[PDB]
Design a binder for this molecule. Structure first.
Ligand code: CU
Ligand code: ZN
Length: 154
């Protein structure tokens, strides 16, 4: 089974233009995330599933913050740690999203720990401005920084 999630730009003032979609499919080796995105800054970007199915801004962190409404990283086991797709932390930690020099992301990625679409229903798929070193050191949540794009999983 699979599901298509449309992604949009987010700012501290709301949700912007659509930048494509990501389709998620259940495979023998876990959930596969096959992006078809454009208009993204080239480089590697933090890619995680957040706890709430909302991309709206919220005023937490000395002001308004883009898609802050989605809460933290999905973690139903309350591990409290950020360790990556192959770690034992947040269940929502996905391998990083690599954007090419044309500003597109088209390479599929796998999360072996996720096994069913049922597990991520009504959650938010997020893309960060910063990367992800899959650790809380030396920067929290892998140095992801601000939220750049977001989509809600129906
Ligand atoms: Cu995130
Ligand atoms: Zn995390």
């Amino acid at each position: 089974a699979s599901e298509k999630v449309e992604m949009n730009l987010v700012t501290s003032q709301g949700v912007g233009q659509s930048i494509g979609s990501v389709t998620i499919t259940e495979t023998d080796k876990g959930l596969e995330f096959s992006p078809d995105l454009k208009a993204l800054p080239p480089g590697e970007h933090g890619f995680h599933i957040h706890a709430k199915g909302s991309c709206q801004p919220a005023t937490k962190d000395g002001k308004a913050s883009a898609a802050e409404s989605a809460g933290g990283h999905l973690d139903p086991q309350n591990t409290g740690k950020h360790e990556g797709p192959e770690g034992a932390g947040h269940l929502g930690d996905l391998p990083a999203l690599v954007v090419n020099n044309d500003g597109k992301a088209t390479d599929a990625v796998i999360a072996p720990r996720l096994k069913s679409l049922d597990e991520i229903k009504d959650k938010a798929l997020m893309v960060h401005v910063g990367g992800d070193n899959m650790s809380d050191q030396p920067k929290p949540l892998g140095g992801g920084g601000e939220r750049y794009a977001c989509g809600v999983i129906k």
